[PDB]
Design a protein around this ligand. Structure first.
Ligand code: F1V
Ligand code: F1V
Ligand code: F1V
Ligand code: F1V
Ligand code: F1V
Ligand code: F1V
Lengths: 160, 160, 158, 158, 160, 158
């Protein structure tokens, strides 16, 4: 079986937790699409072009990762990408509840897209893009949670 | 005992999950007030008049349902409506936590108003007005989650 | 005439159970407090002791009927012509199991509606199990139990 | 050739387990449904009964292999050359224990990736334990089990 | 050991739940800094000066409490205050999840600052500043949840 | 002089317990690591074995006192003149039970303040129960336990 999997999200910015999940996905599936949502409702810190470029560079060492931006409903994009596997990272209980609702909805929308939940390292089990940004905004050290290129862009973003 | 129960919420829009809960409430209590909150803080998709009209039409087949709009504190409205039963739908754990806080607060405000928790069908256990709207905004099919009249109004709303 | 059933092991009946059954009696015309034989749990008190303790602790509530049962819930509720099943809400861990039971009970008897009532903040952190555990270590449990239940628990542990 | 393992007690195998293993077979080339001896749990069905029931209930799935094991998970998975470990997602209480198992299994065998699959809403509130409990009270469990499993459960309880 | 503990938060406004937690902290630690975050992102009902004055007056009877405002990352402030104990109140499961994420982040930022979780009275286990304000805005009685001075300021705030 | 008590079964004491007690010693002047007789749980190690293992595993911490007790928590804490009760935070399921215990303990002894400490991410997914389970299947548990505890666990399972 030559499986195409999709790993969607805002990735604003991509963290070491996302790198962990996408690395596990590439060791399991032949082709992994890391799909970055335009997500204008969330009003992201980084533009879609910035998020795509940051994720491309942070996953460049992974030969079977394709970084792409998308604005549709995830399931509409996934169907057009011929993906049958939907990657989700489960860190804790709060994730679980919302992720079950999304997975049942996604299954209603596209039954041929199977949601799979991967578990990150204990190291990234307590972080989110939101928390990292918040700590960074308040002059806290977030170097440990981010790829080098992402850390450099976050510093540059917060300086201006 | 000739019980008057109140089922409050934003109902923006009323879903099949809300119809399920209010149908269970009508089989248990003599009179059920489906109370629609003005809720301007949430900035609803549908005006109060639209939400009331949609809920009226979606519950018309239930003879002991009264659809009414309200702007007060729920408990202030419930006291003026001579309701002693407060209907809440419990879908999952996240609901549970917030619902317990609301129920203890509502009990402090009006001890004679008893909070009762009803459980929806497995079918509606993973949906919310918020998720349905989000999927609809992103060009996803939500026909299965809504009464026909609500589906028609949601399509019309998103077209303009 | 609306008939509700409040099932459980009630090993022993606590102030938390009295709170839930009192709320149920203010809402429904007749409330059956149904005590499960529950031999799998290996209860401290026999079904007869549990029934007698609950009868005496609810005697002041005119619309409560205390009955013992070994039946499947759905069957006993149908046989009792009840259409409402009362459960108390405590913790998330209780809630999850309660949803599984409620969906099972609904499959078995769709006309039996599960209703969840919320106890006083006072009883929101107690269980029959925790009260027994405190009492096994000679701790003061007078506050959590009806007087007759407290007396029987002391007598049992002596 | 991607080899996945779906471990558990399967005492007995339910429609929820059939749902999870069917999803696993549509994703992975070979799926080993691994039945734990689990003597600590004191199962209703022996390992041999559990294996025979699961074999027959999954016979229609060409890429499922039913095997019994008493080994440490990580060891049996290495010995079976599997790199994927399938778990089903039910409740938060299941999820928490599943995270502990998955982190332990990762410590023991880092190349064994735990994957969580979500069952149909239909089986989201059932467990082998709850089905057995319903059956112990003579309740209708035909809907939750494969026919062969239903027949063996009735025979066992008779 | 002459321990300095910090109890951070928005305290918008300080409630009986916060008074309960800070009272427990003062019975355990020599000096307790009740640290009020400027928190402009949350857009607080009360200004920082109002929140500090309200908390000062509501804790005046506690001799080892110091009420101070701060705008830094909490951990940056805590380090400059020579605090080695970080007080958090745990009411319910939802608190727990977010509090674990914050505590691991705070530990990364300042390992010498130990997070300690205190449990409030059952009486305050179902309230928050947010819920109290919401009930007050909707003409509900919140007298029981607040110190007298806070209740007076909340009434005055909502009248204008 | 601030005296804290860290109670539990400690069957056996793990690196997670060592982490919690080490954090407690950095915060409080004297820490009593209190080992419950806990016969209801039917422990793998006797109270004497559990005390000896914990004594040796905490010997490097000068302000730790390891003591066995069969008393009610509130009584032993009063008798030990402690005003702080240390608990570790793991999972939501642990947290819920911990709140019930803490409210009960507060009813019994209001001057005994329950404090929750958070372990390292390293020990956030382990328990004495899970470590024993891994060891029962001959799995490598050297990483989760003090050396003396690992040796006693191997000897016990042999
Ligand atoms: C598991 O599916 C995800 C996860 C994170 C996501 N962030 C953005 C999207 C795409 C737009 N939104 C959607 O498609 C829903 C279903 C309305 C949420 C997205 C999808
Ligand atoms: C169970 O009581 C509800 C549930 C959903 C609700 N949505 C809006 C309201 C009315 C206004 N708000 C209130 O009355 C609170 C108590 C401040 C929330 C409402 C009430
Ligand atoms: C909410 O329903 C309850 C709660 C507590 C209960 N204790 C005993 C029973 C009856 C026997 N058991 C059953 O009928 C099930 C559904 C198989 C568990 C019972 C039912
Ligand atoms: C997700 O891993 C599972 C799930 C269910 C299981 N039932 C039996 C096993 C194998 C023996 N147990 C182990 O190897 C542990 C890790 C010590 C528990 C098993 C593994
Ligand atoms: C347990 O630490 C808290 C708790 C509540 C808090 N409210 C505001 C702050 C200060 C600014 N924010 C931060 O320092 C984080 C770490 C980015 C949240 C604060 C800190
Ligand atoms: C947080 O308090 C604990 C935790 C673990 C414990 N293991 C044993 C005890 C003492 C005996 N038990 C009690 O005193 C209760 C309160 C009745 C359970 C103990 C206490």
């Amino acid at each position: 079986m030559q499986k195409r999997a999709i790993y969607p999200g805002t990735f604003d910015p991509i963290t070491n937790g996302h790198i962990d999940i996408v690395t596990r996905a590439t060791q399991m599936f032949d082709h992994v699409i890391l799909a970055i949502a335009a997500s204008p409702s969330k009003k992201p810190m980084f533009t879609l072009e910035e998020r795509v470029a940051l994720a491309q560079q942070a996953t460049a060492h992974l030969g079977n990762v394709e970084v792409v931006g998308f604005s549709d409903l995830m399931a509409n994009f996934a169907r057009n990408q011929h993906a049958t596997v939907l990657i989700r990272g489960l860190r804790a209980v709060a994730d679980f509840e919302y992720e079950m609702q999304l997975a049942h909805m996604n299954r209603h929308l596209m039954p041929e897209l199977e949601s799979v939940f991967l578990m990150p390292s204990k190291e990234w089990s307590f972080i989110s893009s939101s928390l990292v940004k918040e700590v960074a905004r308040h002059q806290g050290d977030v170097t440990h949670f981010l790829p080098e290129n992402v850390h450099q862009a976050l510093m540059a973003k917060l300086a201006v």
